[PDB]
Coordinates of C-alpha atoms and ligand atoms in Angstrom, one line a residue:
Chain L
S221 CA 110.4 73.4 125.8
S222 CA 113.7 75.1 126.8
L223 CA 114.3 72.9 129.8
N224 CA 115.8 69.5 130.3
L225 CA 112.7 67.6 131.4
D226 CA 112.4 63.9 130.5
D227 CA 109.3 62.2 129.3
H228 CA 108.5 61.0 132.9
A229 CA 109.8 64.2 134.5
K230 CA 107.7 66.5 132.3
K231 CA 104.5 64.6 133.0
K232 CA 105.1 64.7 136.7
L233 CA 105.8 68.5 136.6
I234 CA 102.4 69.2 134.9
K235 CA 100.6 66.9 137.4
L236 CA 102.5 68.7 140.2
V237 CA 102.1 72.4 139.4
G238 CA 98.4 72.1 138.5
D239 CA 96.6 74.9 136.7
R240 CA 99.7 77.1 136.4
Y241 CA 100.7 75.3 133.2
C242 CA 99.0 76.1 129.9
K243 CA 98.6 73.1 127.6
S244 CA 98.3 75.1 124.4
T245 CA 101.2 77.6 124.8
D246 CA 103.4 75.4 126.9
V247 CA 104.2 78.2 129.3
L248 CA 104.5 78.0 133.1
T249 CA 103.4 81.0 135.2
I250 CA 104.4 81.3 138.8
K251 CA 102.9 84.2 140.8
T252 CA 104.1 85.0 144.3
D253 CA 102.6 87.6 146.7
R254 CA 103.4 86.5 150.2
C255 CA 106.8 88.2 150.5
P256 CA 106.5 91.9 151.4
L257 CA 109.2 93.1 148.9
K258 CA 109.6 92.5 145.2
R259 CA 113.2 91.3 145.8
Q260 CA 112.1 88.7 148.3
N261 CA 109.3 87.6 146.0
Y262 CA 111.8 87.4 143.1
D263 CA 114.1 85.2 145.2
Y264 CA 111.1 83.1 146.3
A265 CA 109.8 82.8 142.7
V266 CA 113.1 81.5 141.4
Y267 CA 113.2 79.2 144.4
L268 CA 109.9 77.6 143.4
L269 CA 111.2 77.1 139.8
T270 CA 114.3 75.2 140.9
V271 CA 112.7 73.1 143.5
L272 CA 109.9 72.0 141.1
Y273 CA 112.6 70.9 138.6
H274 CA 114.8 69.0 141.1
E275 CA 111.6 67.2 142.4
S276 CA 110.3 66.1 139.0
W277 CA 113.3 63.9 138.6
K278 CA 112.9 61.9 141.8
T279 CA 111.0 58.8 140.8
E280 CA 109.8 57.9 144.3
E281 CA 108.7 54.3 145.2
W282 CA 105.0 55.1 145.5
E283 CA 105.0 56.5 141.9
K284 CA 104.6 53.0 140.5
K285 CA 101.1 52.8 142.0
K286 CA 99.6 54.5 138.9
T287 CA 95.9 53.9 138.1
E288 CA 94.8 53.4 134.5
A289 CA 92.3 56.2 134.9
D290 CA 95.0 58.7 135.9
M291 CA 96.9 58.3 132.7
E292 CA 97.0 61.4 130.5
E293 CA 97.2 59.3 127.4
Chain A
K36 CA 64.2 124.6 142.2
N37 CA 67.9 123.7 142.3
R38 CA 70.1 125.9 144.6
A39 CA 73.5 124.1 144.6
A40 CA 76.4 126.6 144.3
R41 CA 74.3 129.2 142.4
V42 CA 74.0 133.0 142.5
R43 CA 70.5 134.2 142.1
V44 CA 69.5 136.9 139.5
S45 CA 69.0 140.3 141.1
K46 CA 68.5 143.0 138.5
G47 CA 71.8 143.8 136.7
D48 CA 73.9 145.4 139.5
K49 CA 75.8 142.5 141.1
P50 CA 79.1 141.4 139.5
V51 CA 79.8 137.7 139.1
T52 CA 83.1 136.0 138.3
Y53 CA 83.5 133.2 135.8
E54 CA 83.5 130.5 138.4
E55 CA 80.3 131.6 140.1
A56 CA 78.4 132.4 136.9
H57 CA 78.1 128.7 135.9
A58 CA 75.8 126.1 137.5
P59 CA 77.3 122.9 139.0
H60 CA 76.0 120.8 136.1
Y61 CA 78.4 122.7 133.8
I62 CA 81.4 121.0 135.5
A63 CA 83.6 119.3 132.9
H64 CA 81.6 121.1 130.2
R65 CA 82.5 124.8 130.6
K66 CA 84.7 125.0 133.7
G67 CA 87.2 122.6 135.1
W68 CA 87.9 121.2 138.5
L69 CA 89.6 123.6 141.0
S70 CA 91.7 120.7 142.3
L71 CA 93.4 117.8 140.4
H72 CA 94.9 114.8 142.1
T73 CA 95.2 111.0 141.6
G74 CA 93.0 110.0 144.5
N75 CA 89.8 110.0 142.6
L76 CA 91.0 107.8 139.7
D77 CA 89.6 104.3 139.0
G78 CA 92.0 102.0 140.8
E79 CA 93.8 104.4 143.1
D80 CA 93.7 104.5 146.9
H81 CA 94.3 107.4 149.3
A82 CA 91.4 109.6 148.3
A83 CA 90.1 110.6 151.8
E84 CA 93.4 112.0 153.0
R85 CA 93.6 114.2 149.9
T86 CA 90.1 115.5 150.4
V87 CA 90.6 116.6 154.0
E88 CA 93.9 118.2 153.2
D89 CA 92.2 120.1 150.3
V90 CA 89.5 121.5 152.6
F91 CA 92.1 122.7 155.1
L92 CA 93.9 124.7 152.5
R93 CA 90.6 126.3 151.4
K94 CA 90.2 127.5 155.0
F95 CA 93.9 128.3 155.6
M96 CA 94.5 130.4 152.5
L97 CA 91.2 132.2 153.0
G98 CA 92.2 133.2 156.5
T99 CA 95.9 133.9 155.9
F100 CA 95.1 136.5 153.3
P101 CA 92.0 138.4 154.7
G102 CA 90.0 140.3 152.1
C103 CA 92.8 140.3 149.5
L104 CA 91.9 136.9 148.1
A105 CA 90.1 137.2 144.8
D106 CA 88.5 133.8 144.2
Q107 CA 89.0 130.1 144.8
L108 CA 92.4 128.4 145.0
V109 CA 93.8 126.0 142.5
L110 CA 95.6 123.0 144.0
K111 CA 97.8 120.8 141.8
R112 CA 99.6 117.7 143.2
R113 CA 102.5 116.4 141.2
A114 CA 104.8 113.7 142.6
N115 CA 104.9 114.5 146.3
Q116 CA 105.0 118.3 145.9
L117 CA 101.9 120.5 146.3
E118 CA 101.4 123.6 144.2
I119 CA 98.9 126.3 145.3
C120 CA 97.9 128.9 142.7
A121 CA 96.0 132.0 144.0
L122 CA 94.6 135.3 142.8
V123 CA 95.3 138.1 145.2
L124 CA 94.1 141.7 145.1
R125 CA 96.4 144.7 145.4
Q126 CA 95.7 145.3 149.1
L127 CA 98.8 144.5 151.2
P128 CA 102.2 146.0 150.6
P129 CA 104.7 143.7 148.8
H130 CA 106.7 143.3 152.0
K131 CA 103.7 141.6 153.7
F132 CA 103.0 139.4 150.6
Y133 CA 106.5 138.0 150.7
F134 CA 106.2 137.5 154.5
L135 CA 103.0 135.5 154.1
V136 CA 104.4 133.5 151.1
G137 CA 107.5 132.6 153.2
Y138 CA 105.3 131.8 156.2
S139 CA 102.8 129.7 154.3
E140 CA 105.5 127.7 152.4
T141 CA 107.4 126.7 155.6
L142 CA 104.4 126.0 157.8
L143 CA 102.5 123.8 155.3
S144 CA 105.7 121.9 154.3
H145 CA 106.4 121.0 157.9
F146 CA 102.7 120.2 158.6
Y147 CA 101.9 117.8 155.6
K148 CA 105.5 116.6 155.4
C149 CA 105.7 117.4 151.7
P150 CA 107.2 120.3 149.8
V151 CA 104.8 123.1 149.0
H152 CA 104.8 125.6 146.1
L153 CA 102.9 128.9 146.4
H154 CA 102.4 130.8 143.1
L155 CA 100.6 134.1 143.2
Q156 CA 99.0 136.2 140.4
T157 CA 98.0 139.8 141.4
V158 CA 95.0 141.5 139.9
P159 CA 93.7 145.1 140.4
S160 CA 90.2 144.0 141.3
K161 CA 87.9 141.0 141.0
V162 CA 87.4 139.9 137.4
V163 CA 83.8 140.3 136.2
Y164 CA 82.3 138.0 133.6
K165 CA 78.6 138.9 133.5
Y166 CA 76.2 141.6 134.8
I167 CA 77.9 144.8 136.1
Chain V
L46 CA 90.0 60.3 143.4
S47 CA 92.8 57.7 144.0
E48 CA 95.7 57.3 146.3
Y49 CA 98.0 58.6 143.6
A50 CA 96.1 61.9 143.4
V51 CA 96.2 62.2 147.2
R52 CA 100.0 62.1 147.2
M53 CA 100.2 64.6 144.3
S54 CA 97.8 67.0 146.0
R55 CA 99.8 66.8 149.2
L56 CA 103.2 67.0 147.5
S57 CA 102.2 70.1 145.6
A58 CA 100.8 71.7 148.8
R59 CA 104.1 71.0 150.6
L60 CA 106.2 72.8 148.0
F61 CA 104.0 75.8 147.6
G62 CA 103.4 76.1 151.3
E63 CA 99.7 75.3 151.9
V64 CA 98.4 72.9 154.4
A65 CA 99.4 69.3 153.8
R66 CA 97.2 67.3 156.1
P67 CA 93.4 67.3 155.6
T68 CA 91.7 70.3 157.3
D69 CA 88.1 70.9 158.1
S70 CA 86.1 73.7 156.4
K71 CA 85.7 75.5 159.8
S72 CA 89.4 74.8 160.7
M73 CA 90.7 76.8 157.8
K74 CA 89.5 80.1 159.3
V75 CA 92.5 80.1 161.7
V76 CA 94.8 80.2 158.7
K77 CA 92.7 83.1 157.3
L78 CA 92.9 84.9 160.6
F79 CA 96.7 85.2 160.4
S80 CA 97.0 85.3 156.6
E81 CA 95.1 88.6 156.4
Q82 CA 95.5 91.8 158.4
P83 CA 92.9 92.1 161.2
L84 CA 90.2 94.7 160.8
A85 CA 91.2 96.7 163.8
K86 CA 94.7 97.3 162.5
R87 CA 94.0 98.4 158.9
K88 CA 95.1 102.0 158.2
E89 CA 91.6 102.7 157.0
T90 CA 90.2 102.0 160.5
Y91 CA 92.5 103.5 163.2
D92 CA 93.4 106.4 161.0
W93 CA 89.9 107.1 159.8
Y94 CA 89.4 110.3 161.8
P95 CA 91.7 113.3 161.2
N96 CA 93.0 114.6 164.5
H97 CA 90.6 117.5 165.1
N98 CA 92.4 118.3 168.4
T99 CA 95.6 119.3 166.5
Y100 CA 93.6 121.1 163.8
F101 CA 91.6 123.1 166.3
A102 CA 94.4 123.8 168.7
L103 CA 96.9 124.9 166.0
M104 CA 94.5 127.4 164.4
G105 CA 93.5 128.6 167.9
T106 CA 97.1 129.5 168.7
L107 CA 97.7 131.1 165.3
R108 CA 94.6 133.2 165.8
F109 CA 96.0 134.6 169.0
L110 CA 99.4 135.2 167.3
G111 CA 98.0 137.4 164.6
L112 CA 99.0 135.0 161.7
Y113 CA 95.6 133.6 161.1
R114 CA 92.3 135.6 161.2
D115 CA 89.2 133.5 161.6
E116 CA 85.9 135.3 160.8
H117 CA 83.7 132.6 162.4
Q118 CA 85.4 132.9 165.8
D119 CA 85.2 136.7 165.6
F120 CA 81.5 136.4 165.0
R121 CA 81.0 134.4 168.2
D122 CA 83.0 136.8 170.3
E123 CA 81.2 139.9 168.9
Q124 CA 77.8 138.4 169.7
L125 CA 79.0 137.1 173.1
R126 CA 80.0 140.7 174.0
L127 CA 76.5 142.0 173.1
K128 CA 74.9 139.4 175.4
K129 CA 77.0 140.6 178.3
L130 CA 76.0 144.2 177.6
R131 CA 72.3 143.2 177.5
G132 CA 72.7 141.6 180.9
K133 CA 72.3 138.0 179.9
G134 CA 75.6 136.1 180.4
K135 CA 76.8 132.7 181.7
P136 CA 76.7 132.4 185.5
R137 CA 79.7 131.0 187.4
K138 CA 79.7 127.5 189.0
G139 CA 77.0 127.0 191.6
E140 CA 74.8 129.9 190.5
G141 CA 72.2 128.4 188.3
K142 CA 69.2 127.6 190.5
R143 CA 70.5 127.1 194.0
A144 CA 69.7 130.7 194.7
Chain U
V51 CA 126.6 136.8 123.6
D52 CA 127.8 136.3 127.1
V53 CA 127.1 132.7 128.1
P54 CA 128.4 130.4 130.9
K55 CA 131.1 128.4 129.2
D56 CA 130.9 124.6 129.7
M57 CA 128.2 124.5 132.4
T58 CA 127.8 120.7 132.1
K59 CA 129.3 118.3 134.7
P60 CA 127.6 114.9 134.9
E61 CA 129.5 111.6 135.4
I62 CA 128.5 108.1 134.2
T63 CA 130.7 105.5 135.8
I64 CA 130.7 102.4 133.6
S65 CA 131.0 99.5 136.0
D66 CA 131.6 95.8 135.3
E67 CA 128.1 94.5 136.2
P68 CA 126.2 93.2 133.1
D69 CA 123.2 95.4 132.2
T70 CA 119.7 94.2 132.7
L71 CA 117.8 93.4 129.5
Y72 CA 114.0 94.1 129.4
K73 CA 112.0 92.1 126.8
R74 CA 109.2 94.6 126.8
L75 CA 108.1 97.6 128.9
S76 CA 104.5 98.7 129.2
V77 CA 103.4 102.1 130.4
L78 CA 99.7 102.6 131.1
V79 CA 98.7 106.3 131.8
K80 CA 95.2 106.9 133.3
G81 CA 93.6 110.3 133.6
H82 CA 90.3 112.2 133.6
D83 CA 90.7 114.4 130.5
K84 CA 91.6 113.1 127.0
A85 CA 93.3 116.3 125.9
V86 CA 96.0 116.0 128.5
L87 CA 96.6 112.4 127.6
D88 CA 96.6 113.2 123.9
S89 CA 99.4 115.8 124.5
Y90 CA 101.2 113.5 126.9
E91 CA 101.3 110.8 124.3
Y92 CA 102.9 113.2 121.7
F93 CA 105.5 114.1 124.2
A94 CA 106.3 110.5 125.0
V95 CA 106.4 109.4 121.4
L96 CA 108.6 112.3 120.3
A97 CA 111.1 111.6 123.1
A98 CA 111.0 107.9 122.4
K99 CA 111.7 108.3 118.7
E100 CA 114.8 110.5 119.3
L101 CA 116.2 107.8 121.7
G102 CA 115.5 105.1 119.1
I103 CA 112.9 102.9 120.9
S104 CA 110.3 102.0 118.2
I105 CA 107.3 102.2 120.5
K106 CA 103.7 101.5 119.7
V107 CA 100.7 103.4 121.1
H108 CA 97.2 102.0 121.6
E109 CA 94.1 103.2 123.5
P110 CA 92.5 100.7 125.9
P111 CA 88.7 101.1 126.3
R112 CA 87.5 103.5 128.9
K113 CA 85.4 102.7 132.0
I114 CA 82.9 104.9 133.8
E115 CA 82.1 104.8 137.5
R116 CA 78.6 106.0 138.5
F117 CA 76.8 106.3 141.9
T118 CA 73.6 107.9 143.1
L119 CA 73.0 110.2 146.2
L120 CA 69.9 111.7 147.7
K121 CA 68.9 115.2 146.6
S122 CA 67.4 117.0 149.6
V123 CA 68.4 116.8 153.3
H124 CA 65.1 115.4 154.4
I125 CA 62.6 113.0 152.9
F126 CA 62.0 113.4 149.1
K127 CA 63.5 110.0 148.1
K128 CA 61.9 110.2 144.6
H129 CA 64.4 112.8 143.4
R130 CA 68.1 111.8 143.0
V131 CA 71.3 113.6 141.9
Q132 CA 73.8 111.4 140.2
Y133 CA 77.5 111.7 139.7
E134 CA 80.1 110.2 137.4
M135 CA 83.9 109.7 137.5
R136 CA 85.5 109.1 134.1
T137 CA 88.9 107.4 133.8
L138 CA 90.4 107.5 130.3
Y139 CA 93.3 105.2 129.4
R140 CA 96.4 105.2 127.2
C141 CA 99.1 102.6 126.9
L142 CA 102.6 103.0 125.5
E143 CA 104.5 99.8 124.8
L144 CA 108.3 99.7 124.8
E145 CA 110.2 96.8 123.2
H146 CA 113.9 95.8 123.3
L147 CA 114.8 98.4 126.0
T148 CA 118.0 98.0 128.0
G149 CA 118.1 98.6 131.7
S150 CA 120.3 101.7 131.4
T151 CA 118.0 103.2 128.8
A152 CA 115.0 102.2 130.8
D153 CA 116.1 104.2 133.9
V154 CA 116.5 107.5 132.1
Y155 CA 113.4 107.2 129.9
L156 CA 111.2 106.4 132.9
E157 CA 112.5 109.1 135.2
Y158 CA 112.3 111.7 132.4
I159 CA 108.8 110.5 131.7
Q160 CA 107.8 110.5 135.4
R161 CA 109.1 113.9 136.2
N162 CA 107.1 115.5 133.4
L163 CA 103.9 113.7 134.4
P164 CA 100.9 116.1 134.6
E165 CA 99.1 116.6 137.9
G166 CA 95.9 115.0 136.8
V167 CA 97.2 111.6 135.6
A168 CA 99.1 108.6 137.0
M169 CA 100.8 105.6 135.3
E170 CA 101.8 102.0 135.9
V171 CA 104.8 100.3 134.4
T172 CA 105.0 96.6 133.7
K173 CA 108.6 95.6 132.9
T174 CA 109.2 92.1 131.4
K175 CA 112.8 91.5 132.4
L176 CA 114.5 88.5 130.8
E177 CA 117.4 86.4 132.0
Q178 CA 118.9 83.0 131.6
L179 CA 118.2 79.9 133.7
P180 CA 119.2 79.7 137.3
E181 CA 122.5 78.2 138.3
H182 CA 121.0 75.1 139.7
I183 CA 118.9 74.5 136.6
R184 CA 121.6 75.4 134.2
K185 CA 124.4 73.5 135.9
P186 CA 123.4 69.8 135.7
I187 CA 122.2 68.5 139.0
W188 CA 120.3 65.2 138.4
Chain B
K104 CA 83.8 54.3 162.3
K105 CA 87.4 54.6 160.9
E106 CA 90.8 55.8 162.1
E107 CA 93.9 56.4 160.0
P108 CA 95.7 59.7 161.0
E109 CA 99.3 58.4 160.4
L110 CA 99.3 58.7 156.6
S111 CA 102.3 57.3 154.9
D112 CA 103.8 60.6 153.7
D113 CA 107.4 61.4 153.2
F114 CA 109.0 64.9 152.7
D115 CA 112.1 66.6 154.1
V116 CA 112.4 70.4 154.1
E117 CA 116.1 70.2 154.8
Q118 CA 116.6 68.3 151.5
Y119 CA 116.4 71.6 149.5
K120 CA 118.5 73.7 151.9
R121 CA 121.1 74.2 149.3
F122 CA 119.1 75.9 146.5
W123 CA 117.4 77.7 149.4
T124 CA 120.5 79.7 150.1
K125 CA 121.9 80.7 146.7
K126 CA 121.5 79.9 143.0
Chain M
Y28 CA 87.4 119.4 170.0
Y29 CA 85.7 117.0 167.7
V30 CA 82.5 118.1 166.1
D31 CA 80.3 116.2 168.6
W32 CA 80.5 114.0 171.7
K33 CA 79.6 111.0 169.6
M34 CA 82.7 111.5 167.4
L35 CA 84.9 111.7 170.5
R36 CA 83.5 108.4 171.7
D37 CA 84.4 106.7 168.4
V38 CA 88.0 107.9 168.7
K39 CA 88.3 106.3 172.1
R40 CA 86.6 103.1 170.8
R41 CA 89.0 102.9 167.8
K42 CA 92.0 103.6 170.0
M43 CA 91.0 100.8 172.4
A44 CA 90.4 98.3 169.6
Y45 CA 93.9 98.9 168.2
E46 CA 95.6 98.2 171.5
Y47 CA 93.8 94.9 172.0
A48 CA 93.7 93.9 168.3
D49 CA 96.5 91.4 168.4
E50 CA 95.6 90.0 171.8
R51 CA 92.0 89.4 170.6
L52 CA 93.3 87.8 167.4
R53 CA 95.4 85.2 169.2
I54 CA 92.7 84.2 171.6
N55 CA 90.0 84.2 168.9
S56 CA 92.1 81.8 166.9
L57 CA 91.6 79.1 169.6
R58 CA 87.8 79.5 169.6
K59 CA 87.4 79.3 165.8
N60 CA 89.2 76.0 165.5
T61 CA 87.6 72.6 166.1
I62 CA 90.7 70.5 166.5
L63 CA 91.6 71.9 170.0
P64 CA 89.8 70.2 173.0
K65 CA 86.4 71.6 173.9
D66 CA 87.7 72.2 177.5
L67 CA 90.3 74.7 176.3
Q68 CA 87.8 76.5 174.0
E69 CA 85.4 77.1 177.0
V70 CA 88.3 78.8 178.9
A71 CA 89.1 80.9 175.9
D72 CA 85.5 82.2 175.7
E73 CA 85.8 83.4 179.3
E74 CA 89.0 85.3 178.6
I75 CA 87.9 86.8 175.3
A76 CA 84.7 88.1 177.0
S77 CA 86.7 89.5 180.0
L78 CA 88.4 92.0 177.7
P79 CA 87.0 95.6 177.8
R80 CA 83.7 96.1 175.9
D81 CA 85.0 99.0 173.8
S82 CA 87.7 96.8 172.3
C83 CA 85.4 95.2 169.8
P84 CA 85.7 95.6 166.0
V85 CA 81.9 95.4 165.5
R86 CA 81.3 98.4 167.8
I87 CA 83.3 100.7 165.5
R88 CA 81.0 103.1 163.7
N89 CA 81.8 104.7 160.4
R90 CA 80.8 108.4 160.4
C91 CA 81.6 111.5 158.4
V92 CA 84.9 113.2 159.3
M93 CA 83.3 116.6 158.8
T94 CA 79.8 116.6 160.2
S95 CA 79.7 113.2 162.0
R96 CA 76.5 112.0 160.3
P97 CA 76.1 108.3 161.5
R98 CA 74.6 107.2 158.2
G99 CA 74.6 108.3 154.5
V100 CA 78.4 108.2 154.3
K101 CA 80.4 107.1 151.3
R102 CA 83.2 104.8 152.4
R103 CA 85.7 106.0 149.8
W104 CA 85.7 109.7 150.7
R105 CA 84.6 109.2 154.4
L106 CA 82.2 112.1 153.9
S107 CA 78.5 112.5 154.5
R108 CA 76.2 112.7 151.5
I109 CA 75.4 116.4 152.1
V110 CA 79.0 117.4 152.5
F111 CA 80.0 115.4 149.4
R112 CA 77.6 117.3 147.3
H113 CA 78.7 120.6 148.8
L114 CA 82.3 119.9 147.8
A115 CA 81.5 118.3 144.4
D116 CA 79.1 120.9 143.2
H117 CA 81.7 123.7 143.6
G118 CA 84.2 121.7 141.5
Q119 CA 86.5 121.2 144.5
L120 CA 86.8 117.4 143.9
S121 CA 88.9 116.1 141.0
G122 CA 87.2 113.9 138.4
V123 CA 83.7 114.2 139.9
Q124 CA 81.0 115.5 137.6
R125 CA 77.3 115.4 137.2
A126 CA 76.3 112.2 135.5
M127 CA 74.6 112.5 132.1
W128 CA 73.8 109.5 129.9
Ligands
MG301 MG1 76.7 120.6 167.2
MG302 MG1 79.7 80.6 167.5
MG303 MG1 78.2 98.3 162.6

């Protein structure tokens, strides 16, 4: 709720991140373990957050092929 | 009949210290553990390395101080430092005690790659808890 | 399962770093082989045994230097001396049954 | 009467880097004996109150590990001797703790840790949005 | 029988090279 | 000296496995994947079997580090069941007590 997601961008982000988003508390949890160090994981964790936001705003051409059974509402 | 770490009754002429006078089922009831470390906790690793190091000290301290050792050692591990508490009889001259203290501290520290503390308490004879 | 869901499943996999193209159940093991540490290289495996050679040799040298006194080794030497006195010792090489 | 006059010489260089703010700091001490943890909690609470931290202390439920071994060294499999390892827990939560105050409190706590216990710290550091997210980029 | 290995998928890793370096 | 000849053999076996651990992993990756051609996988099987016998993870045997008992060994302490009781009954292991409930 503290970000600048649009109506379309927010819906795509939920469909993109999967189960990491809680629908009740509206909190997004990202857990990273691959980097050996905590500083590398911290830099990787923030990298995921920024790339997931810059991608939810790219309305690609194939996105118009939405099915009526895939609508959340 | 159970025989684990017990001293059998033989008239009333054999002295027994506090540690040896209690059966093993009394652990955590009347007597504590001779060694304390993190390895045997719930979600902690590195428990086998501590055990083998503990056994070596039981054999090194017993051999470094022949005859003058009173009873079992007490090993405490805090941070990365190792504290060894011992009870030693009044057998060797104080010059030899400080030699062995200096020898033990340096040798173990360069062997386990960790600082070692060696604290000694001197008693005139073995402490008797029952019989005698 | 629709074409829209396929793109989203692949697009999410691309960002988080998983495999994008479809992969067989058996073909995912090669990912697991490199993802985890092999069994032969775990510290629990190759460092399982304490180095008894250093433990035995060190206390052997300290015994001869008078800094460590081992009762058990003294027991063997004392009994070994008695066997020699009684006339029953270990013969040299090539002396067992060839004579 | 004779005392060493002014035997204190620490330095605290105040740099220009902004300090790190921790939303909440959690300390979970685990040990085998309750009495040590009971005394350790009192030491931690007393030190925390003096520094002005407003901490809360709660006791998580304990868990017990059990396993069974054979009794004799040959046959006799109908007689067993069991053993048990008990790990008792204690959690101390810290709220609204700055980075500078966090460093001294933890190191003072860690150095006085008894030999029979260990602890885990869960620090919830808070910070603003990343530059890319904050600065408008489509 | 079927064959369609060239799925119409588009994604460039180099697009996000900027955020990759620094915030 | 290790406590027994069997223990000495295990040390050699573990040492050999460590040297060829990475080389085996690379070759074994080809075999366990079905996307490579079957001709290449058959050649890989020849090479992986040409490695020395002792360099096999399955041949590693878990014994006790004190008495080298081939079985009855707890994996956590790497000790035989008899030795574990000997140390635990004297109170020489922290946090280990006789179970009563
Ligand atoms: Mg033998
Ligand atoms: Mg097969
Ligand atoms: Mg096997």
